[PDB]
Amino acid sequence: QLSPTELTEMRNDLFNKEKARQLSLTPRTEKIEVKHVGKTDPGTVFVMNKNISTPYSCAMHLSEWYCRKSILALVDGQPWDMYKPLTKSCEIKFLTFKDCDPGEVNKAYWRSCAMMMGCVIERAFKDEYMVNLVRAPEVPVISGAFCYDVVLDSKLDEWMPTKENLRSFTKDAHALIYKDLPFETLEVEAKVALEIFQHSKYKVDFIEEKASQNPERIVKLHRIGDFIDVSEGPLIPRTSICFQYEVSAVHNLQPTQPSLIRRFQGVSLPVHLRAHFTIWDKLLERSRKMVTED
Amino acid sequence: TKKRFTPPIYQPKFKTEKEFMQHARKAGLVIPPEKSDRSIHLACTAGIFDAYVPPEGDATERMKKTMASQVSIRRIKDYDANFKIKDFPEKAKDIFIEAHLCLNNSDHDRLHTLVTEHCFPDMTWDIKYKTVRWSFVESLEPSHVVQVRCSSGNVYGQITVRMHTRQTLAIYDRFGRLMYGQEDVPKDVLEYVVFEKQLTNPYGSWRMHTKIVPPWAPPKQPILKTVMIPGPQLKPEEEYEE
Amino acid sequence: VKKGFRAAFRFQKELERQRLLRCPPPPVRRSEKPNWDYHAEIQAFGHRLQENFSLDLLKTAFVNSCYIKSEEAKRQQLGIVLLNLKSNQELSEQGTSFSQTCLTQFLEDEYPDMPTEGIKNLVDFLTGEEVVCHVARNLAVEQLTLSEEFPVPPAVLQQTFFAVIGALLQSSGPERTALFIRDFLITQMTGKELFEMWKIINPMGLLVEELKKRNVSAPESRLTRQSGGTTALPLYFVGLYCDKKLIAEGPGETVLVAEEEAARVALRKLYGFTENRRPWNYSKPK
Amino acid sequence: ISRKWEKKNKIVYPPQLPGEPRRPAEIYHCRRQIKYSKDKMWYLAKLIRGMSIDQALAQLEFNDKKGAKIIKEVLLEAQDMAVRDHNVEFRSNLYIAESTSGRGQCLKRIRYHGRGRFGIMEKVYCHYFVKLVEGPPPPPEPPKTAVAHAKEYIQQLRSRTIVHTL
Amino acid sequence: TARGTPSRFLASVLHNGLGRYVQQLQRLSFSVSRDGASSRGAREFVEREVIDFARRNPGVVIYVNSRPCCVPRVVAEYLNGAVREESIHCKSVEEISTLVQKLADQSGLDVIRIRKPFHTDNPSIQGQWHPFTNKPTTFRGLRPREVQDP
Amino acid sequence: KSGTWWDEHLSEENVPFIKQLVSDEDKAQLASKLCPLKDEPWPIHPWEPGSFRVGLIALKLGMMPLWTKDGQKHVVTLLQVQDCHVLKYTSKENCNGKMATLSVGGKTVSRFRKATSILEFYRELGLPPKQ
Amino acid sequence: ISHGRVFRRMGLGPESRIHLLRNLLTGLVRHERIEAPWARVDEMRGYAEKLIDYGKLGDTNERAMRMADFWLTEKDLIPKLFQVLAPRYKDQTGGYTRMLQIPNRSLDRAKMAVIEYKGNCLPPLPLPRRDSHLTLLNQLLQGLRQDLRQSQEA
Amino acid sequence: AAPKNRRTIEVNRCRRRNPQKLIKVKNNIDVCPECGHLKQKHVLCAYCYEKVCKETAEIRRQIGKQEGGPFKAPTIETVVLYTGETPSEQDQGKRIIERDRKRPSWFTQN
Ligand SMILES: [Mg+2]
Ligand SMILES: [Zn+2]
Structure with a gap:
């Protein structure tokens, strides 16, 4: 069986392979007229390139402020990753944390921070233990924390993390924030996605569920540098967006006898909505408590 | 000594001639008309005498038009006896090719002999600080003299010629970065080149005048970079309208 | 304007030199x-x-x-x-x-x-x-x-x-x-x-192989001198002892660097490529 | 007078080879004979030196000095001049590489003093020079750390020879 | 400088003289004038001295370019690539004969301040002095007032 | 790269809640130290000659007259003790001095206007910050 | 040394200061909104608040009419105080005015401020708004509140 | 008292280029959510405040055409109406100021 340090080597090659195939499918140069519909600079048009230009590139034309504060793009009423190539001409709008109703942005940020935790979970434990990622529960943001279900080896059936172990998870999360890695989104056919995660049993089941929902049966793929995972919905562009990051506690889901599923919870806040030390300690306590999706 | 105090650039606002004379009256600046026998001499005409529209799909009433051109040939042969129509289309290729090779080496001293004064700015103005690499790979279809017409003190004759040949174009910006085109792959071109010659002038010659752009032409190659077309820059008081 | 030609000619020569320094020409074949x-x-x-x-x-x-x-x-x-x-x-x-x-x-x-x-x-x-x-x-x-x-x-x-x-x-x-x-x-x-x-x-791993060819016991490393152990600028002298006989001794900032230089010192002596070795003879062959 | 700064936007570099890296675009622009002091203007050009085009415009937009409103006008027209004439794709992908002030041709008037004395005052003028470069602002140099201080000190102790001998 | 000029250490070109001596002067280029009082001493050097000077130095290529000039010069090129240009303006034959020979004797290294009048790549033969050179060793390598076997 | 304060991003509904929340915590933190002799106090030694005990940190209220039984008038100063607690203790050895130091604070202040390093010292001490 | 001094030193003296503040207050009652230096408005804002208190006392009180007659140079504005302004703030006991800082003016780069009477008929100023309750941080606090309230009820 | 000696450019650069002399970067700048222009966190938007003054001035010019002279202020409240609006239920017995313009979107009728 493939080793853990060489299992990611092929997942990147398969990911890059498919990332380069889509680019070749596009003609040498094809233009798309993207119209801006917002309170600011209304009527501006971006004559961009098909399958290459992203919403971020459209903001670079306007100003650096749009780039720094535009967390997510709204394309034809549908949210759009800021680093996702544009396939056709369409209206575009930019979303920020500070809006009248930034519901979609909050969901994206909450999903990204969970995916970030999955990356540090695959490196903390030794190479002798089999850490198998399951999924990222789509819990609301008012719940007080984001979670990511995980399974551990039979040896670690009763081992419970301590305060010092929970702190090391964060130092790996902030170390991931210091690299300033961009979230890369790739929409692939379900059949192609199964090949990448053919080794992990849990991921295959999750992919099958997504294929049934969409008639096209395409699955979105996101990767942070080398780490690759399957997630639902758009994500934020970069890791540097999150200023405060901490994993609060770990809860064991029931029933434990048939299988053990641990729930790594956490909470975070971006740079745009930085909180105070005193208020940040209040949010952590709520996060330590176990949360259950509706 | 050696002292001259200069002020900053003024940048006159009104460009039109009317506004200048409309503003010179408000300022009391009276400019009496000129008086001189010498006038300028133009070697080329400003525009075409009879607009040509190529037939769609080229990429009684029809027969008469071909005869009108034949009549104009006579005029061109009254000032030049040794002139044939079965050689000019072969001669135009030499001018066309030789006029586009002067853009690579910036040979403007010889480019005036090939093109007119009306055409020379259009070609050189945009590429003043740019590098061009144009070549003639092959010729697809022979050229044909589609239309010949003359003017009604001087007399000029225009000879429209149709060209269908492959070309290679790569335009590089001031810094050497690729700006437009591909130097490896040629492409088909269908452009009608117009020539002019001042018959009256004993030292005249046939030179490129302009390029006919048909309304039914395919779109040109797209550029490499992206563009942003801003909208109205409204004032605070004024509101935006759909 | 002052009349004369010698100073203007001499000033043109200095301008050329200044121009060459600011814009040196590309080298060419002799x-x-x-x-x-x-x-x-x-x-x-x-x-x-x-x-x-x-x-x-x-x-x-x-x-x-x-x-x-x-x-x-x-x-x-x-x-x-x-x-x-x-x-x-x-x-x-x-x-x-x-x-x-x-x-x-x-x-x-x-x-x-x-x-x-x-x-x-x-x-x-x-x-x-x-x-x-x-x-x-x-x-x-x-x-x-x-x-x-x-x-x-x-x-x-x-x-x-x-x-x-x-x-x-x-x-x-x-x-x-x-x-x-x-x-x-x-x-x-x-x-x-x-x-x-x-x-x-790894010079120490090479010295152990040269001493096996000569049927000599493996060398032992020991500290002969020491100064400033607790300081940022220490000095150690490690000596290789074969059968309690000093064969080499080398200095270093750490005990590992000094132990590596000592092995290098022994190899030079084994091969006879020391500094004290007599110079190469360039005299005309007899 | 010298006007070399305007001649630097006319140099044409040879086409780059396929393997060579993308060359950043350089845009030179200036304004001459500004009724302002070069010493007072130097403090404004030193402020935006190294900043991005969009950050410099924000600092100059809330400054109370008169030179701020003048520099901001020179930056706005160099920004447009870059994308329109120098083939710059993104107008926000620019940073201030060079920004300094120069002395201009100044006038001389008389200032009257007491007891039939007089002084000579000069109506001062200045120039403003700016150079824009395509790309992001170069990251600031981190302050020297203790490891570099010690690494440099030990290197000096290792480079010392025995002087005035063989 | 001394402080206003650069410096170098005494050295040679390819360890010259160690195995064999190789003359570093490689080329001499004279520029005399057929007419001109400045070149009178240079013309007489070309009639009797230059030919006998080349016989002794066969490894030096000598070029005599007779052209109009007000200041005759001799250019010396050396193996190491250095080029020294000199003027023989209004100099007697005896002054030019000692000058050309000086150029042949030199190595081409910059004529600047030399720090030491000596150079050796192997300065020591018994061991470069160090603090522990003349210090005795103590039993068990103990330090001053160090309790052993505590 | 922009600084922030405790109520820059809060809405109209959370500002009153946060204020009352942290206010009630201070009450509970201060009302939890009123029984020091039951919360594992340190040994209580008697007074010996040459001993020096702690002092206080009071707040100057004002001035008031005062008459004695002889008729003479004296002016006095009113010093109010409010929220005075012992913060830490350093032994003679670790003090680098003849005596041993005892730290005392007074006048509870806001937590939103103090340094992070100072807030964490009080967090483990179970007290609000001192002015 | 200025410990406790609450009033500023403007104009040419104590009397001229009152005359400057009176010309700003008079224009504030006529137009209900003015722009002036920040210091001169912050010093006049107190008088604009206490002027409404005299208008609530009624036009029959001689003392109140002697204040308005002095503080209102234009005498057509005195009925507006007793018949328009004071009735407007009849329910309110304070906070009749709002003062906001605006970009410094160009001539002298002086610190400026705009002051108006609440409830006027003029286009609303672009008042600063607090971050929405639907933001990430406020939703994390709204959830915390519910639990603390839910636990208390338990 | 006059200078005893001339101060050098080296001495003067250290005084002129001292960090205290230099301009300090401002971090209180942000974008206006309405127009997108820049503003300070504690200062009103120059752009949005300007469009209020243009309209407010037009309303004050209409008020003058009704008063028709000085010392002619009313003893009642005032209301601004635009093309396509009529007196409201609460806007009874007031001084309506007719404006030949569409009501600004930001101007909310109260
Ligand atoms: Mg007088
Ligand atoms: Zn605004």
């Missing part, structure tokens, strides 16, 4: 510059070195394949008699082999306690691309080299310096040619250490 005669510059090359070269052979030692191929390209463009010029490939192979077999003999008889791997690394340094090109740019070999590109590449220049040795070998023979390798290539390792030309790794 043959292109004025005052050059290839036949006269190549005869002095031999007389300068006090050798009875053969002109016919020496002229082909500077001709390179790259120059011949390009020389033909120039004629084809102009449509221009065939060239019978030969390259220096054959001459280079003779000189390179003779040099490797002559340098080896010189070193194999001077240091008979050095292994073949060390004697090979030395010959690969004296005949290296760095050393041979330094001797060539100071013997007027790059000025006569007939190459396609200037400055002459190191490999092309290295291949041309050994062809000159092949021409001297045919002309004056091995005995007279071995003196040219001793006076120009053996003199490139005078003020240099053994492990500065023969770079190795």
Whole structure:
């Protein structure tokens, strides 16, 4: 069986392979007229390139402020990753944390921070233990924390993390924030996605569920540098967006006898909505408590 | 000594001639008309005498038009006896090719002999600080003299010629970065080149005048970079309208 | 305006010098510059070195394949008699082999306690691309080299310096040619250490293998001197003791660096490549 | 007078080879004979030196000095001039490489003093020079750390020879 | 400088003189004038001295370019690549004969301040002095007032 | 790279809640130290000659007259003790001095206007910050 | 040394200061919104607040009419105080005015401020708004509140 | 008292280029959510405040055409109406100021 340090080597090659195939499918140069519909600079048009230009590139034309504060793009009423190539001409709008109703942005940020935790979970434990990622529960943001279900080896059936172990998870999360890695989104056919995660049993089941929902049966793929995972919905562009990051506690889901599923919870806040030390300690306590999706 | 105090650039606002004379009256600046026998001499005409529209799909009433051109040939042969129509289309290729090779080496001293004064700015103005690499790979279809017409003190004759040949174009910006085109792959071109010659002038010659752009032409190659077309820059008081 | 011409002329000369410094011109081959005669510059090359070269052979030692191929390209463009010029490939192979077999003999008889791997690394340094090109740019070999590109590449220049040795070998023979390798290539390792030309790794693991060949007990490392252990600037002297007999002792900032230098000191003594060793004899052979 | 700064936007570099890296675009622009002091203007050009085009415009937009409103006008027209004439794709992908002030041709008037004395005052003028470069602002150099101080000190202790001997 | 100029250490070109001596002067380029009082001393050096000087130095290529000039110069090129340009303007033959010979004797290295009048790559033969050179060793390598076997 | 304060991003509904929340915590933190003799106090030694005890940190209210039984008038100063607690203790050895130091604070202040390093010292001490 | 001094030193003296503040207050009652230096408005804002208190006392009180007659140079504005302004703030006991800082003016780069009477008929100023309750941080606090309230009820 | 000696450019650069002399970067700048222009966190938007003053001035010019002279202020409240609006239920017995313009979107009718 493939080793853990060489299992990611092929997942990147398969990911890059498919990332380069889509680019070749596009003609040498094809233009798309993207119209801006917002309170600011209304009527501006971006004559961009098909399958290459992203919403971020459209903001670079306007100003650096749009780039720094535009967390997510709204394309034809549908949210759009800021680093996702544009396939056709369409209206575009930019979303920020500070809006009248930034519901979609909050969901994206909450999903990204969970995916970030999955990356540090695959490196903390030794190479002798089999850490198998399951999924990222789509819990609301008012719940007080984001979670990511995980399974551990039979040896670690009763081992419970301590305060010092929970702190090391964060130092790996902030170390991931210091690299300033961009979230890369790739929409692939379900059949192609199964090949990448053919080794992990849990991921295959999750992919099958997504294929049934969409008639096209395409699955979105996101990767942070080398780490690759399957997630639902758009994500934020970069890791540097999150200023405060901490994993609060770990809860064991029931029933434990048939299988053990641990729930790594956490909470975070971006740079745009930085909180105070005193208020940040209040949010952590709520996060330590176990949360259950509706 | 050696002292001259200069002020900053003024940048006159009104460009039109009317506004200048409309503003010179408000300022009391009276400019009496000129008086001189010498006038300028133009070697080329400003525009075409009879607009040509190529037939769609080229990429009684029809027969008469071909005869009108034949009549104009006579005029061109009254000032030049040794002139044939079965050689000019072969001669135009030499001018066309030789006029586009002067853009690579910036040979403007010889480019005036090939093109007119009306055409020379259009070609050189945009590429003043740019590098061009144009070549003639092959010729697809022979050229044909589609239309010949003359003017009604001087007399000029225009000879429209149709060209269908492959070309290679790569335009590089001031810094050497690729700006437009591909130097490896040629492409088909269908452009009608117009020539002019001042018959009256004993030292005249046939030179490129302009390029006919048909309304039914395919779109040109797209550029490499992206563009942003801003909208109205409204004032605070004024509101935006759909 | 002041009248005169001498000061204005002298001021124009300083302006040119200033312009050259601000905008230095690209280097060009010496043959292109004025005052050059290839036949006269190549005869002095031999007389300068006090050798009875053969002109016919020496002229082909500077001709390179790259120059011949390009020389033909120039004629084809102009449509221009065939060239019978030969390259220096054959001459280079003779000189390179003779040099490797002559340098080896010189070193194999001077240091008979050095292994073949060390004697090979030395010959690969004296005949290296760095050393041979330094001797060539100071013997007027790059000025006569007939190459396609200037400055002459190191490999092309290295291949041309050994062809000159092949021409001297045919002309004056091995005995007279071995003196040219001793006076120009053996003199490139005078003020240099053994492990500065023969770079190795893990010297302590190599000393244990040389002492097994001589049936000697494994060495023991011990501290002979020490100062400033707790400080940022310490000094340690580690000594290798075989059967309680000091064979080597080396300094270092740490105990591991000092233990590594001690092994290097022992190897130099085992092979006889110490600094105290007597100098190479350049006196005329009797 | 010298006007070399305007001639630097006319140099044409040779086409780059396929393997060479993308060359950043350089845009030179200036304004001459500004009724302002070069010493007072130097403090404004030193402020935006190294900043991005969009950050410099924000600092100059809330400054109370008169030179701020003048520089901001020169930056706005160099920004447009870059994308329109120098083939710059993104107008926000620019940073201030060079920004300094120069002395201009100044006038001389008389200032009257007491007891029939007089002084000579000069109506001062200045120039403003700016150079824009395509790309992001180069990251600031981190302050020297203790490891570099110690690494440098030990290197000096290792480079010392025995002087005035063999 | 001394402080206003650069410096170098005493050195040679390719360890010259160690195995054999090789003359570093490689080329001499004279520029005399057929007419001109400045070049009178240079013309007489070309009639009787230059030919006998080349016989002694066969490794030096000498070029005599007779052209119109007001200041005659001799350019010396050396193996190491250095180029020294000198003027023989209004100099007698005896002054030019000692000058050319000076150029042949030199190496080409920059004529600047030399720090030491000596150079050796192997300065020591018994061991470079260090603090522990003349210090005795103590039993068990103990330090001042160090309790052993505590 | 822009600084922030405790109520820059809060809405109209959370500002009153946060204020009351942290206010009630201070009450509970201060009302949890009123029993020091039951919460594992340190040994209580008697007074010996040459002993020096702690002092206080009071707040100057104002001034008031005062008459004695002889009729003479004296002016006095009113010093109010409010929220005075012992913060930490350093032994003679670790003090680098003849005596041993005892730290005392007074006048509870806001947590939103103090340094992070100072807030964490009080967090483990179970007290609000001192002015 | 200025410990406790609450009033500023403007104009040419104590009397001129009152005359400057009176000309700003008079224009504030006529137009209900003015722009002036920040210091001169912050010093006049107190008088604009206490002027409404005299208008609530009624036009029959001689003392209140002697204040308006002095503080209102234009005498057509005195009925507006007693018949328009004071009735407007009848329910309110304070906070009749709002003062906001605006970009410094160009001539002298002086610190400026705009002051108006609440409830006027003029286009609303672009008042600063607090971050929405639907933001990430406020939703994390709204959830915390519910639990603390839910636990208390338990 | 006059200078005893001339101060050098080296001495003067250290005084002129001292960090205290230099301009300090401002970090209180942000974008207006309405127009997108820049503003300070404690200062009103120059752009949005300007469009209020243009309209407010037009309303004050209409008020003058009704008063028709000085010292002619009313003893009642005032209301602004635009093309396509009529007196409201609460806007009874007031001084309506007719404006030949569409009501600004930001101007909310109260
Ligand atoms: Mg007088
Ligand atoms: Zn605004």
